[PDB]
Each structure stands twice: as structure tokens, then as C-alpha cells.
Amino acid sequence: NLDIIGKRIEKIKQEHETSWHYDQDHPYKTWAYHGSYSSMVNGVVRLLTKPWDIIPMVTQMAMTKVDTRTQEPKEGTKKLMKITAEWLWKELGKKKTPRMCTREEFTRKVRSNAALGAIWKSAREAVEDSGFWELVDKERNLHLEGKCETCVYNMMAIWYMWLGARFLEFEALGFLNEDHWFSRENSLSGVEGEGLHKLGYILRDVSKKEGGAMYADDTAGWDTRITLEDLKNEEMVTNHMEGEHKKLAEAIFKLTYQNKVVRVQMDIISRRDQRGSGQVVTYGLNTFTNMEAQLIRQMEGEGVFKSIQHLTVTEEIAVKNWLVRVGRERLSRMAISGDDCVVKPLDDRFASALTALNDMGKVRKDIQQWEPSRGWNDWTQVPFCSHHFHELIMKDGRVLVVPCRNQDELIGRARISQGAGWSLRETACLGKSYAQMWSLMYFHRRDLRLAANAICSAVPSHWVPTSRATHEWMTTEDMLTVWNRVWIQENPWMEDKTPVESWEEIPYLGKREDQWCGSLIGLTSRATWAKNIQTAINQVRSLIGNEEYTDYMPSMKRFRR
Ligand SMILES: CC(=O)Nc1ccc(-c2csc(N)n2)cc1
Ligand SMILES: [Cl-]
Ligand SMILES: [Zn+2]
Numbered sequence: 001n002l003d004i005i006g007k008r009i010e011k012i013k014q015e016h017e018t019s020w021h022y023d024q025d026h027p028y029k030t031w032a033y034h035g036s037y038s039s040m041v042n043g044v045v046r047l048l049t050k051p052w053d054i055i056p057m058v059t060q061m062a063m064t065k066v067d068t069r070t071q072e073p074k075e076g077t078k079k080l081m082k083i084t085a086e087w088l089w090k091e092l093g094k095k096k097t098p099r100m101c102t103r104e105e106f107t108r109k110v111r112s113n114a115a116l117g118a119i120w121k122s123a124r125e126a127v128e129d130s131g132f133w134e135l136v137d138k139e140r141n142l143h144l145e146g147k148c149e150t151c152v153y154n155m156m157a158i159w160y161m162w163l164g165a166r167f168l169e170f171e172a173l174g175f176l177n178e179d180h181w182f183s184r185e186n187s188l189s190g191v192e193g194e195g196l197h198k199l200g201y202i203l204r205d206v207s208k209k210e211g212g213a214m215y216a217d218d219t220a221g222w223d224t225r226i227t228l229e230d231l232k233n234e235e236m237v238t239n240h241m242e243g244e245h246k247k248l249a250e251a252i253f254k255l256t257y258q259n260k261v262v263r264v265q266m267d268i269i270s271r272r273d274q275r276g277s278g279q280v281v282t283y284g285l286n287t288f289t290n291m292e293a294q295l296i297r298q299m300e301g302e303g304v305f306k307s308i309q310h311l312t313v314t315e316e317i318a319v320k321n322w323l324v325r326v327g328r329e330r331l332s333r334m335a336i337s338g339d340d341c342v343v344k345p346l347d348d349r350f351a352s353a354l355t356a357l358n359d360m361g362k363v364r365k366d367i368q369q370w371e372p373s374r375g376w377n378d379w380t381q382v383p384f385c386s387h388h389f390h391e392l393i394m395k396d397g398r399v400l401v402v403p404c405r406n407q408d409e410l411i412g413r414a415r416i417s418q419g420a421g422w423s424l425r426e427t428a429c430l431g432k433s434y435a436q437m438w439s440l441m442y443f444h445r446r447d448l449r450l451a452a453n454a455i456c457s458a459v460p461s462h463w464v465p466t467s468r469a470t471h472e473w474m475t476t477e478d479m480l481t482v483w484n485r486v487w488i489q490e491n492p493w494m495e496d497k498t499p500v501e502s503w504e505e506i507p508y509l510g511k512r513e514d515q516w517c518g519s520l521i522g523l524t525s526r527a528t529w530a531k532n533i534q535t536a537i538n539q540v541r542s543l544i545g546n547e548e549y550t551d552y553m554p555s556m557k558r559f560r561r
Contacts, residue, residue, distance in 0.1 A: 080305065085292055101174035172245070176237075184202065204401055212347045219364065222290075414435075433466060436479055534553065
């Protein structure tokens with residue numbers, strides 16, 4: 001307990017000796033208590049989406065369990081998790097080599113803008129000061145000694161550490177993301193590096209497997225369900241390491257993941273369970289443990305073991321043998337993105353195979369603990385990564401599988417910014433990012449293709465999209481050329497590589513399907529907005545001023561004379 005959280009706690013107390021009031025009013029039960037001491041609106045996107053100013057599902061988006069425990073899993077459950085985790089690390093390691101990430105790599109990220117959950121004023125000034133690395137060196141040396149001093153989270157939830165602890169985290173465990181351990185190639189169930197023009201093709205491929213319904217059960221507060229046993233299983237990645245890397249990774253797991261200390265608005269508490277690490281490391285270890293949990297739920301449905309109370313020698317061999325024999329074909333019946341999964345099991349016994357799942361603490365959201373899962377019969381209805389997927393046939397017979405979600409959510413998100421000090425140019429460039437994403441991913445939604453064309457017409461041609469998966473819309477290349485590259489040239493599911501010559505070759509959903517997914521097509525106003533769009537474009541041009549603009553609206557047949 002305190003042999004590991006004490007040094008950090010003592011340090012924080014000393015720096016705060018005056019107000020070290022041990023308040024007996026602290027609202028903590030599970031969180032150990034040691035002591036105490038807004039969405040802005042994007043004006044460019046809003047002026048070009050006037051019909052949505054009277055839709056509450058859009059306009060409301062811009063307005064306005066950490067404290068729980070998880071019963072220890074049973075001996076049968078613990079054995080199932082340990083055998084499965086050992087096997088899974090070995091599979092993920094067959095074609096990969098664990099390795100330290102470098103300051104030279106850490107800075108590069110910082111030179112660009114990749115959320116580092118950090119807390120000089122810019123992180124760009126820390127890595128350049130050789131003073132920062134000296135502090136990193138001290139903690140780094142302490143980690144090698146099996147001790148920590150300055151690796152403490154500030155819950156905001158979202159837990160932000162100091163850069164020194166982040167860099168360190170990244171040095172020891174960044175290889176999982178940087179070298180693509182959770183790629184569909186390295187993991188089979190994984191979709192790291194995929195993006196939205198891929199995810200539907202991947203679900204359609206899972207649908208091709210003989211088996212039962214497609215299951216997509218959510219976990220309530222997945223991170224708050226992460227147990228110390230799960231952490232012991234994740235930590236086994238270090239069995240694959242050597243030298244300094246092994247000791248540095250072992251210290252991240254022991255000192256920062258399995259024996260945490262955090263600050264809260266300031267109470268100084270510690271928990272030895274739950275997920276509380278870096279968002280990128282969190283994503284990879286959530287994928288790992290979700291893959292493990294779903295293989296075990298598959299084993300339960302298949303009758304590989306009879307009970308979670310304890311495993312018989314024979315069953316331990318049967319589970320291990322199931323993995324070696326069918327483990328890979330099985331991970332393949334899954335699409336897993338951190339806590340999000342889709343599973344096509346061998347048959348529907350999976351639906352009521354719930355004892356391992358509930359005993360691991362991964363209780364399903366929106367269904368009685370022991371009510372058997374609802375199955376999806378059509379891959380085009382299955383929810384994944386906040387989307388569903390349509391099969392869309394081009395006038396020339398070729399097949400697109402496209403991402404989709406309710407259009408009010410897409411419009412409402414593009415109308416929001418986070419943070420202060422945005423110029424009109426930067427606000428315009430963020431509007432252009434959304435517009436290009438819509439042109440590439442949601443071109444099949446009539447309102448989004450029109451609104452994208454309008455925003456790109458209203459923002460100077462040469463201004464670069466900005467924002468503080470393959471984000472191919474973050475470019476000043478022509479959007480038809482990018483569309484061709486993503487959907488035709490580089491699309492492994494498209495055999496005919498004939499380029500598309502114009503946007504009018506690129507289809508929409510059916511008119512009724514577009515309405516079902518939130519389109520305003522057929523409202524009197526949606527017609528006033530499409531008819532008068534050059535007036536809205538001109539309003540925004542007049543605000544931005546005398547700049548080089550391009551008219552993209554005649555790419556659409558209706559504005560093409
Ligand atoms: C822009 C455009 O194509 N206008 C339009 C007109 C009517 C309809 C319609 C009638 S009954 C139904 N379900 N949908 C859809 C769209
Ligand atoms: Cl269905
Ligand atoms: Zn849809």
C-alpha cells in the first residue's frame with residue numbers, strides 16, 4: 001500500500017503543509033483518502049446549416065462509477081483469464097518485437113498535436129528544455145529502483161499526469177500503438193489503423209462466417225469494471241521483454257497502473273484497480289482484455305468448460321487445446337475497438353453464456369444481469385464505433401460499404417469547438433475539416449454533401465484544414481482525387497479500379513433511407529436552404545473578407561445549370 005503511494009503522497013503534502021486539513025467530510029468509500037489541502041459554437045458551420053437552428057437535437061448539443069468496487073472473480077474465472085491472456089500475448093508477439101519508444105519519437109508527437117493528457121506553459125517547451133529530461137531521468141532512475149515520486153493523476157472522468165510520467169508511460173508501453181499490435185493483421189479481431197471507409201467492409205466479412213446472430217453488447221463504465229486480475233494479465237506483456245525495457249515496463253504496471261494515487265477537486269486517494277492510464281495505452285489494453293473476455297464468453301457458449309467455480313485438469317488442457325486449435329478462427333469472428341465489440345459466435349448458445357462475463361465484472365448495459373443478449377440478424381443494423389453501415393450500389397454496379405449515423409449528431413458535432421482564442425481563420429479551417437470529412441465518409445447523405453460543398457465554397461480555397469484511424473480529409477488535395485484513392489484505388493474490396501470522373505457518379509442512399517437516418521430532404525425549408533445556398537456562402541465570404549474562393553456547388557447536378 002503506502003510503501004508505493006507514500007513517497008508521492010509525502011511529496012504532495014510537504015509542498016502543501018499549511019492547508020493539509022484531513023477533512024472528515026470527504027465523500028469517499030472505495031477511493032482511499034490519505035488527506036486534503038464549455039462547448040463554444042463554430043459560427044462558420046452554424047451560418048451554413050440554418051435549417052438546424054430550430055432542431056433541438058442539434059441545438060441542445062452545444063448547451064450546458066469511479067466510486068465503486070468489483071468482487072474478485074472465482075478461481076475458475078481467474079484460471080480462464082490467465083490461460084487466455086498468456087496465449088493471446090504470445091499470438092500478438094509472434095510477428096512483433098516489444099521495444100522502447102524514444103524522446104526523439106515523444107518530441108515528434110509534441111511537435112505535431114497528439115493529445116498527451118498532460119497538465120513552461122506549452123509541452124513544446126518542456127521537451128526542448130534539458131531541465132525536463134533531468135526530472136524524467138530522476139523518476140526514470142527511481143523506476144529502475146522500483147520506486148516513483150511524481151507519477152500522479154489529476155482526475156478531470158479523464159486522468160491527466162505530468163509530461164514526465166506520460167513520456168515514461170510512452171517509453172515503456174507506446175510500442176503497442178506505435179508498432180500496431182492491435183492491427184487486424186497482428187490481432188485478427190483488432191481494427192487499429194482501419195478508419196470508417198473500412199469498418200463496414202470488416203463487419204460484412206465477419207457476417208460471411210457461418211454462425212449465429214451478430215452480438216454487440218456494451219459494458220457499463222468498462223474502465224470502472226477493470227479489475228486487479230485483468231491488470232496482472234495485461235502486465236504479462238513484460239514476460240516478452242528484456243533488459244532495461246522489461247524493468248521500466250514492470251514499474252509502469254506496478255507503480256502507476258496497479259497502485260495508483262490521484263488528485264481531485266484536493267483529496268489524495270489511492271486505488272489498486274480500475275483503468276486509469278494514458279488514453280492510447282488505455283485503448284490498446286482495453287482491446288486486449290475485451291478480446292480475452294469475448295474468447296472466454298465464446299468458450300462458455302461452446303461448452304469448453306462446465307463451471308467458473310473451478311477448472312478440472314482435463315478442462316485446463318481442453319481450454320488450452322481449444323485456443324491452439326481454433327483460437328485464431330475465433331478472434332476472427334470479432335471486431336473489437338477498445339471496450340466496443342461485435343462477435344459472430346459459432347451459434348446462439350453465446351446469447352445466454354453469461355456466467356464468465358458477469359464474474360469478470362464486464363456486466364452488460366441496458367439488460368437484466370441474466371437476461372440473454374439480443375442478436376442482430378443483419379450486419380447493416382449492427383452498431384459499432386458509434387456508426388451503422390449501408391451497402392450502396394453505384395450506377396456502374398460497383399459496391400460501396402459506407403459509414404452512417406443519425407445526421408443530427410453529425411451536424412450538432414460540426415457546430416461545436418473546444419477551447420479559447422480561436423481566430424475567424426482558425427474557426428473557418430475547423431469548419432473545413434468537418435466539411436472534408438463529410439465529403440469522404442458521408443457523401444451519401446444529401447444534406448451533408450450539400451453543406452460540405454457550401455462550407456468548402458465559403459472558406460478560402462488554399463486555407464489548410466485544422467483540428468487542435470485514417471483522417472484523409474486533413475489535406476488541401478482535391479476531394480475527388482482523395483475520394484478515388486480511398487474508395488477505389490486503395491480499397492481491397494473493390495476489384496475494378498476504374499476512376500470516378502465526377503461527383504455525379506458517386507451515389508446517395510435512397511431518399512427514404514436518407515430520411516430514416518435524419519435527412520431534412522422534403523421539408524419546405526430544406527428546399528429554401530438548398531435554393532438560396534449562394535446567399536449563405538456569400539454571407540460567410542463577406543465576413544472572412546477579400547480572399548481566393550472556389551465555387552464547389554456546380555459539382556452537384558441541381559446547381560449545374
Ligand atoms: C430533394 C428531393 O429529392 N425531394 C424529395 C421529395 C419527396 C420525397 C419523398 C416523398 S415520400 C418520401 N418518403 N420521400 C423525398 C425527397
Ligand atoms: Cl437485425
Ligand atoms: Zn444510416
